[PDB]
Ligand binder design. Sequence first.
Ligand code: HEA
Ligand code: HEA
Ligand code: CA
Ligand code: CU
Lengths: 51, 534, 59, 45, 133, 102
Amino acid sequence: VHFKDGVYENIPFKVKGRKTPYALSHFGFFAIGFAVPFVACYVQLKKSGAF
Amino acid sequence: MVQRWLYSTNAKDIAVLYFMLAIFSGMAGTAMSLIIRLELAAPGSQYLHGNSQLFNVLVVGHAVLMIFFLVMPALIGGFGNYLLPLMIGATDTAFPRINNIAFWVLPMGLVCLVTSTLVESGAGTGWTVYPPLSSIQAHSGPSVDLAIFALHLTSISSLLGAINFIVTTLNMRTNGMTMHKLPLFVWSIFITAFLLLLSLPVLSAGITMLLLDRNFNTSFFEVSGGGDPILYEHLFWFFGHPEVYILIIPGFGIISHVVSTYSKKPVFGEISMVYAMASIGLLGFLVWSHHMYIVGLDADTRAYFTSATMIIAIPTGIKIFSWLATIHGGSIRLATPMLYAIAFLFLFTMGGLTGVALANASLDVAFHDTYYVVGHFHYVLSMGAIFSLFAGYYYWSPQILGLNYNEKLAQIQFWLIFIGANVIFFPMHFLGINGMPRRIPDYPDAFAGWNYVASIGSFIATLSLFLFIYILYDQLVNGLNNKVNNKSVIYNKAPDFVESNTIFNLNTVKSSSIEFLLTSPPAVHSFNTPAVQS
Amino acid sequence: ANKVIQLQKIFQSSTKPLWWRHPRSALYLYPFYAIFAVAVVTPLLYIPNAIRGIKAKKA
Amino acid sequence: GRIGESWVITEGRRLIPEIFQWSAVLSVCLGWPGAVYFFSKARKA
Amino acid sequence: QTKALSKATLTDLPERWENMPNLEQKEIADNLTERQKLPWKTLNNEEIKAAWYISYGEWGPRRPVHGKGDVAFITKGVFLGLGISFGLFGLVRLLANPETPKTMNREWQLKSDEYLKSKNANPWGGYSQVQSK
Amino acid sequence: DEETFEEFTARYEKEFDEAYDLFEVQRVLNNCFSYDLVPAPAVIEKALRAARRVNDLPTAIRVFEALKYKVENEDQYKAYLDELKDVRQELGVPLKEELFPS
Ligand code: HEA
Ligand code: HEA
Ligand SMILES: [Ca+2]
Ligand SMILES: [Cu+2]
């Protein structure tokens, strides 16, 4: 059936076996999404000019 | 690893991919909503140095990223593709490559939308992308193209997924599950797959018409040439009200499970409720012009479209009376999904009462394009669908990902969002009855009173989301230990008054559906031999 | 010329993936991955010229 | 039969405080911006 | 014929039942099931308290949804969440275009209200446009 | 359409006699108490005899807590406890109140 079942093996990201801390890529993956519209604001605010 | 998350055909992998896209785009949309409420805090330019066009691009990024990228891929994407085949015992969905492309079209829609926001300004149009504002003379540049392409891509995604859903629920049922004996969530996904397949192509026709009219020198909506921008409003809203009913029919299917399993008594009159769901599904196709009460219709279109939009109140009424009936006379276990479910039905009936107030075309001339309407739908979207989303996550994720959450953290998260979002969306009725118009970045200064309280409520709601995401982190790194301590709740149903605490251990789950009797996190191939049923 | 049994044999007698099981599944798919590679990276090399307003010259 | 005590005087002794508790929970639930108006400068406080 | 248990392994069972090394939970459930087979006037009332508690006590699966002493925890959590929401709101209000529009003071608003009574505004409700210091 | 109280108490009187293990009497009691009406004395007396037959004293403690929550007064409760005191002295089952006084 060729796909390994487990508890942490239903997700496309590692948690346990890891050199970096997991909270880094957790809050990073979510903070890039939170910082999408702020980057949108920075590019548009410089394009018309004021920031 | 690439064969399981990029070439995948199994429904659960695609479902959790749907879910992580949904929560990514959901906080990407609520960041826009926070910037909106910070611009609406005090009158005058506050954070955005003028630039009202940017306020419009943030408003519609918020709207599209909250509807087409959070609520749909979190309800019919995630919960749909996960818990439809396990609750009908199907070994997979029929058409699995369809399911995989129906996921992976969505990040490309997200990419097209945010590149639209970064070229000229973004679509500064309204989520209804009404011409002649959205055409070339008023919105130059390739932004509105990329927004139309993003909406094309989510149209492709949730049409192909709806075809996948309808054939795997008409063809892949188990040995005892006839149509009457379905769970009340698969009936919900059944009916929204119907409304999706019957509603998406008029939207696709309308927006590729708008694309050709911008880009191929046509005239369907340019009145300089003979078009009509009210043909677009018909072609949009014939999709648009079936869209706002498919944003809440799976929420109804979730809440009917939650209230049953925490009342510990079945839902009162189950097939009168599937009749009510089907009646709301049909009669939502006959009410589309109630968003068009002002455009200059007949007298008797606005007499018909006022009676037909209030016969909607009867099957929704009996759904809510049936919920309160099956909660009357039970053993209410005040867990986190039950709190979310009762707050759902209370705030949804508040949004429904203000919706029936809106539904009179005699009265909607005092309320159209005001903040009364934005109160009406943020009472049934952020309190209907979002509260059903939180109830569904807190109800199913200990089964799905296998790790429990901190329960008292979940209850402060619930109470924080229930306080703060009521605090933002309650004074919108006050501003709208005083005459405050919609979609404006700057208001007259007599509206500065009830806008400060609403931006405060949005800060409470966004910090409730930050608490929820810390709850996700604590679930994903300490849920195995949330089993071993009791910062969680483990058993969904308490023992009854006379059974005792070994008999309950031999009967540890008393459910009306297969989804909890599965292995936590379930097998890659559940149901090789089929689940027999009487 | 009714090759269906000779092709059923090798399409069940192989553990190569299905888009490789045929004999001539190199002549399709070695050019196809190159065409795909030059097809998806080239729209996104033009995006910083599109965000900053540089159009493509008529020369 | 009517064993002893009567049926909604036991239910009266039950649900007399539910009336006042309901009035408290709805008066807080719907009347929370009245305190904002009380502490507002629209009262010219 | 199984006679009664020791006193000093069942005195006050409903409070030390969960600090219990978990092997002897089994070898205290089974002999209570054995002792229940007698006539029910045989049993001393120390075990009838213990036999009720293993079946119907508020432990394990009959644990409450939240313990005794956490509605205080989540009331304090709700109130601190409201406090830190107010605080971060008031902090980010301190970076927003530091000048006020000229209408928002009492040197503009009573001239506005005199203009509204100058043009005879609403008699029923109020017209007084005063909200600022 | 639906069923008389007297036939109901003739149904659960048979169904309590037709029990064989501790799952079954704890199921038949839950099923008879989760109705609108509190059961008759002759039904709960078959319930007490059934819980005697399967050697469980905790459910025979729980029958009285169940009726005490089910009745509307405590005069009905004292009526019940005098309706079946002699069976509570034949079986010798204790009530929860005098074994756990507050
Ligand atoms: C899904 C629908 C949805 C939701 C939830 C919201 C929620 C919010 N919206 Fe609204 N909004 C719209 C859809 C929605 N909105 C639409 C369609 C318009 C019309 C646009 C137009 O007029 O053109 C609009 C317009 C609109 C206006 C009117 C201004 C205008 O018309 O220009 C405002 C102002 O207050 C606003 C702000 C907010 C805020 C502060 C929230 C807050 O409630 C945000 C807080 C929400 C959460 C914290 C939800 C939790 C987050 C998750 C990601 C869920 C995760 C759970 C799981 C994954 C299980 N949005
Ligand atoms: C979740 C999505 C959702 C749901 C469920 C609804 C539900 C309803 N809506 Fe709404 N609506 C929207 C999403 C939704 N709406 C959106 C997004 C907009 C703005 C679009 C835009 O951007 O322009 C909008 C705006 C909108 C308009 C257009 C006005 C305008 O735009 O200016 C109208 C007009 O009829 C309307 C009415 C109703 C009615 C009558 C219901 C009914 O279904 C409510 C039924 C519920 C009840 C009635 C309460 C429960 C029943 C009882 C307790 C029984 C007794 C009750 C009675 C007898 C009344 N709403
Ligand atoms: Ca402003
Ligand atoms: Cu509608």
